[PDB]
Design a protein around this ligand. Sequence first.
Ligand code: NA
Length: 213
Amino acid sequence: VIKEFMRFKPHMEGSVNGHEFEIEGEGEGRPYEGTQTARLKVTKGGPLPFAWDILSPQISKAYVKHPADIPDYLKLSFPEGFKWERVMNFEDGGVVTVTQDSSLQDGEFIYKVKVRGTNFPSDGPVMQKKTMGWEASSERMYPEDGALKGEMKMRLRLKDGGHYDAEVKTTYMAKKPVQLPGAYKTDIKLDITSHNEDYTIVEQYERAEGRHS
Ligand code: NA
């Protein structure tokens, strides 16, 4: 049911510092190669008064290259799919939580994402839009409590040349108890490849590949 080429349709809504928004789009990729692109648009609440970069990672784990000897739990979960929940704790007190449903419907993945951000400083780089994309990350993946967990520190580049850090924890839960893997690592790099001035129209690319740790 997962072909070498698969499209996906994300819908994301929520709020950051009280600012509500909705976003839609369409993407495509090669799940076994760990590669994908997407076209996103802000359909409600645009232009966003905060950095697009905090939303970009809440937008696809069926697209991670896995070696044969590591069970690809999240691909295996299809077609029913899986859900995931995330917390990002930013270094200046900003927090984002996320809940997400992923399913496979009529040959395309469907993503429903709910995002809540709060406690970002008004003069911080998120609310002032001083960010410039994520450095590559490595997510530590491990089974726990009958779910698949991921842990990573993520690094946002700043316009001034510094960095702005987040500690991130995600739980990924298949809708059926397909095979959990052992502990491993996933290397991920997300790039913003195009955007309009005020980021109401955005394109992104991500590559992700699991490996033994
Ligand atoms: Na390692």
